[PDB]
Amino acid sequence: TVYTFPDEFKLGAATASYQIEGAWDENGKGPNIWDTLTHEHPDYVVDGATGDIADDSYHLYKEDVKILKELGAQVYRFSISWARVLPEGHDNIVNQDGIDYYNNLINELLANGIEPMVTMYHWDLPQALQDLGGWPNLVLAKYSENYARVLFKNFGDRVKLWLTFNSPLTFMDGYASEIGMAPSINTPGIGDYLAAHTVIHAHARIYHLYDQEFRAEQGGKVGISLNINWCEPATNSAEDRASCENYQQFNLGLYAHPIFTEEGDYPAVLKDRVSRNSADEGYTDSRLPQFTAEEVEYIRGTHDFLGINFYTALLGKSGVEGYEPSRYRDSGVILTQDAAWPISASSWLKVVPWGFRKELNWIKNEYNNPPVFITENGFSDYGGLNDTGRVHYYTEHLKEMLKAIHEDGVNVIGYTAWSLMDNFEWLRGYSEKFGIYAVDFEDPARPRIPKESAKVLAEIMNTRKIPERFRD
Ligand SMILES: OCc1ccccc1O[C@@H]1O[C@H](CO)[C@@H](O)[C@H](O)[C@H]1O
Ligand SMILES: OCc1ccccc1O
Ligand SMILES: [Cl-]
Ligand SMILES: [Cl-]
């Protein structure tokens, strides 16, 4: 039993638009912040790589559907490129080519018995909106609403699973370094908090929009996908446990407390620590933006499910480190990795499968067991089809998730592996491979070929169980 998927549980795979599509300026698509980063700042990216072509999924979407069908995916999570649909960011111009492209993909998926799950925003903000300041500028909440309306109107008759945002904890970091994630702005501890604030507002507007303009007719569900690492106390002390709770509240709670709790608002520890630190460093005003009571009420409850992106764990101990100002410094935890944990091709990603079960339990307890869809989980290497490390990563993480479900009563409802194919891994370019299908980036045809992990995941999807040879 502990090795069998619940009957209704949905299994599939995931991608993101900039990471796979290419066709960056084709047929009316406008520029986004990743076009800008990779074109203007190739020194920020391994190999000076760009997403200009990537997997060429703009042209090759039927091949993506073919491999999804071979895999036996029940669900395909993909994102929509804002600037492909609204080239100017604002809703004055709708690019019919972008409408047609996503309709073609959606229709191809449905004709092959695969359910679309659509992420509205996976990091590719139109440059015209970044030029207003991007996420730190609250005007983007209304712009996000208007973008979502175009998506619901055009696609919501066929798409019944939506995520507003993906991994805002990561993309807010684009406002915390001059050389980092797009738009590569150096406002740590100030502009990243403003970005989060706008994102939360935007998410809430999009959810209310669905309720007001679309839900009765379309009958779908709207969530948000939050990334979070498990943080294991470095020792059993109460103080180290306190530091790990700080980590959860500063990383997951920042987004989830306003939306998923009865109280709403930011976590108290976030408000209090940033207030104190801001005062101590001479600011008149806290660096943390505030919600009014009316805003707290508007934002809380804006969810039909919680998306989780889970990859790894850290060790946390009591203390403070990091630059002043920064969110890491504000969080009051000293973070490390255990040298004993298996490594990947990504410096930040160690293999700690039991951390997944711990995280799922933390979420269950903090948020009253919301329905949780694992929207990303996966592993990097540098290449190879005999990807034993990735196979082990998946089988162990899925075992841990199944224990969370069956032993711990966590309401996990679906899982999409990150990623369907090797793709453009942001600042790492094509150097880090997260796919279950390999892609030859030197071959203009970008053929997709299955790795061992794709074969094992197909076996899991077909049998609906962890195969005996992978059991403890
Ligand atoms: O790297 C950012 C990141 C860190 C920890 C948890 C989730 C994350 O974010 C996810 O990670 C994937 C692998 O890096 C990216 O390819 C996905 O686009 C991103 O959504
Ligand atoms: O987040 C990186 C970092 C910054 C300053 C000091 C120590 C650190 O690990
Ligand atoms: Cl101890
Ligand atoms: Cl066997």
Ligand code: NA
């Ligand atoms: Na329209």
